[PDB]
Amino acid sequence: EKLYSRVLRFFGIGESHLVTLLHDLIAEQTDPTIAPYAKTGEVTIRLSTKAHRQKEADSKLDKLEKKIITIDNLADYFYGYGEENSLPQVVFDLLKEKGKTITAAESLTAGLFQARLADFAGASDIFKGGFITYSIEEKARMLGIPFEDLQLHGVVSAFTAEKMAERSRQLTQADLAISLTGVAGPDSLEGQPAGTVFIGLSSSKRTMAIKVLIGGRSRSDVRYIAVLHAFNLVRQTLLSHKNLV
Amino acid sequence: EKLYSRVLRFFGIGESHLVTLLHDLIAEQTDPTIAPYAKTGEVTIRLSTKAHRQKEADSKLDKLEKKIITIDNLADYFYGYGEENSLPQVVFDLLKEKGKTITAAESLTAGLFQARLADFAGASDIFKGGFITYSIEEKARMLGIPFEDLQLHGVVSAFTAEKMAERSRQLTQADLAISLTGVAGPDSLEGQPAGTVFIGLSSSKRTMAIKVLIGGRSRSDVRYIAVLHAFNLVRQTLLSHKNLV
Ligand SMILES: [Cl-]
Ligand SMILES: [Cl-]
Ligand SMILES: [Cl-]
Ligand SMILES: [Cl-]
């Protein structure tokens, strides 16, 4: 008999919060065993059971996974399976599955989002290119956003996130466009504290932006975690059944 | 007794070739010590000598260093010192020191070069933004390169690398522009093998391109190493006392 495992991957809930929900079934567990593991920007849960064949183990792993997912809104945070899966891999597969293309305009991440897209073979089917608008002048110049408007609202704002996404979509005619603008830290920017990030998303149907706070993190961690927030926003939009793309 | 160390950092030569050039010196060196080390993209040599003062230690570390750098073309590959140092860090400091700004147009690296620039605090002083031209369509549209010529020469060509660098410099008004186009792999393109990368560099004085071969490497390593080749090209141009920028 071999040890079979299954890894559940979650984004949007901290490892300290998720296990408080779970401890009912962690303090009660038997077989499969449950083991949570946190990493930069996300958390996972390892289920482990003994069985003779992958079919038998899958059947027991499925029952405990159903218990976990239905708790609270964990279905909103669970995004995939696998020791190596990641939000960018899930989004890449989802983009190819739905025949959509994506572009981006990045400031503080400065290319990390689009570089993660190119990590996967065949990315050219879903990604044709994008923009790194690191200055206010290049946000205006590259994308065609009025310079005064950027100055008035600030580059760290929902307005600027929405405009970067809408204009980069219109310049590339990709199906979706992501924008990332915020404060890498540690200094505040425009009165916005370190870790404040606005992430825009634009399709032909709608343009919107989310505001996230990645507080208490290094420069590199804010940029890295902001990329995951952007990929998760794409994931939710593609999985939504609401004609969003 | 106190241990005093010095780390020499090299780019453009592999571990096998470096150790071969150093064979005679290493076989005859007892104090200071000599230890070569390698990782993806670069190689280092650590020298150790003991003394309870640096002027005594630095004097013999200096004589071992001179013997090393005078071997063959190792002066061409040596780029800096320090256990925690890097080629992007050295090039970043050089851009600040010389008061030069830089932009980029990236295809296969897809933003890794510009994302590496933003790793350093104050990157906004020397970097205002750039382009990710992942497709032949966006190479033409974003940079204004005549399409017929891109298809004629091929996207993996010195011609295309030169045009990408020249156009991105002219669109941003930056002092320098880097371009990266090549065969990420693992299977060939345009009859060129995987790892074939053309790297353009444009100033108002001159536009040129180099060709590098990163063969037998995975996609991610090709992109990672291509980024370093681009940084080294910037380094050599800024250090060249030849009216190149
Ligand atoms: Cl799994
Ligand atoms: Cl930003
Ligand atoms: Cl050193
Ligand atoms: Cl070599």
Q: Which residue of A128, A150, A179, A218 to mutate against B (max B Cβ within 10 Å)?
A: A128
One-letter amino acid identity for A206?
A: R
Q: A92 touching B, CB under 8 A? A: no
- φ and ψ of B52, to 5 deg: -110, 25
Q: Looking at the CA of A199, name the nearest ligand.
A: 2
Q: Token digits for B154?
A: 């091929």
Q: Is A137 on the interface with B (CB under 8 A)?
A: yes
Q: Is A130 close to B135, i.e. CB distance below 8 A?
A: no
Count CB-CB contacts under 10 A for residue B65: 18
Nearest CB among B115, B121, B139 relative to A110 is that of B115
Q: How was this structure determined?
A: X-ray
Among B112, B117, B123, beta carbon nearest to A115: B112
Q: How far is A87 from chain B (nearest CA, A)?
A: 18
Question: Chain B within 8 Å of A120 (Cβ-Cβ)?
Answer: no
State how far Cα A55 lies from the chain centre: 31
Find the closest chain A residue to B187 by CA distance: A121
Least Cα separation, residue A125 to chain B (angstroms): 10
Radius of gyration, alpha carbons of chain A: 20
DSSP category for residue A193: P
Q: Assess A13–B contact: CB distance below 8 Å, yes or no.
A: no
| Backbone φ, ψ for residue B88 (5° rounding) | -60, -40
Q: Which two tokens stand for residue B215?
A: 């063969």
Cα A221 to Cα A185: distance, rounded to the nearest angstrom:
10
Task: Tell me if A118 and B223 make a contact (CB, 8 A cut-off).
Answer: yes
> What DSSP string describes A3-33?
EEEEEEEE-SS-HHHHHHHHHHHHTT--SSE
CA-nearest residue to A172 within chain B is B138
The token pair that represents A30 in the structure block: 């038997």
| C-alpha A99 – ligand 1 centre gap (Å) | 26
Q: Do residues A201 and A207 touch, judged by C-beta distance below 8 A?
A: yes
Query: Given an 8 Å threshold on Cβ–Cβ distance, is B132 in contact with A131?
Result: yes
Contact yes or no for B147/B155 (Cβ under 8 A): no
Q: Tokens representing B132?
A: 């990710």
Smallest Cα distance from A112 to chain B, Å:
6
How big is chain B, counted in residues?
Answer: 245
Burial of A119 (0-12, 13-18, 19+ CB in 10 A): middle
DSSP letters, B67-106, are HHHTSTTHHHHEEEE-TT--HHHHHHHHHHHHT--EEEEE
Cβ atoms of residues A119 and A90 within 8 Å: no
Q: Compute CA distances B48 → B29, B35, B68, B79, B202, whole Å.
A: 11, 8, 14, 19, 41
Ligand nearest to the Cα of A4, by number: 1
Q: Which residues of B touch A111 (CB under 8 A)?
A: 106, 110-115, 118, 132
Task: From residue B196, give the alpha-carbon distance in Å to each of B10, B125, B191, B192.
Answer: 22, 32, 10, 7
CB pair distance less than 8 Å for A118 and B133 = no
| SS3 labels along B176-219 | EEEEEEECCCCCCECCECCCEEEEEEECCCCEEEEEEECCCCCH
Closest to B231 measured CA to CA, from B176, B168, B167: B176
Residues of B in contact with A136 (CB under 8 A): none
User: Strands B2-10 and B78-81, how do they pair?
Assistant: antiparallel
Q: Regarding beta strands A176-182 and A196-202, do their DSSP bridges make them parallel or antiparallel, or are they unpaired? A: antiparallel
In A155-194, the residues whose Cβ lies within 8 Å of chain B are: 171-172, 184
What does CATH list as the number for B82-245? 3.90.950.20
Domain locations in chain B as residue ranges: 1-81, 82-245
Query: Using DSSP, how many helices (H) and how many strands (E) does chain A show?
Result: 9, 9
CB contact under 8 A, A135 and B128: yes
Question: Are A33 and A47 contacting, i.e. CB atoms less than 8 angstroms apart?
Answer: yes
Which residues have CB atoms below 5 A from the ion given as ligand 4? B 13-14, 17
Q: Does B137 touch chain A (CB under 8 A)?
A: yes
Contact A177, A104 (CB under 8 A): yes
Look at residue A68 and give its three-state secondary structure.
Answer: helix
Given a contact cutoff of 8 angstroms between Cβ atoms, the answer to whether A228 and A41 are in contact is yes
Is the Cβ of A112 closer than 8 Å to some Cβ of chain B?
A: yes
CA distance B206 to chain A (A): 24
Kindly provide the resolution of this structure in angstroms, with one decimal.
2.0
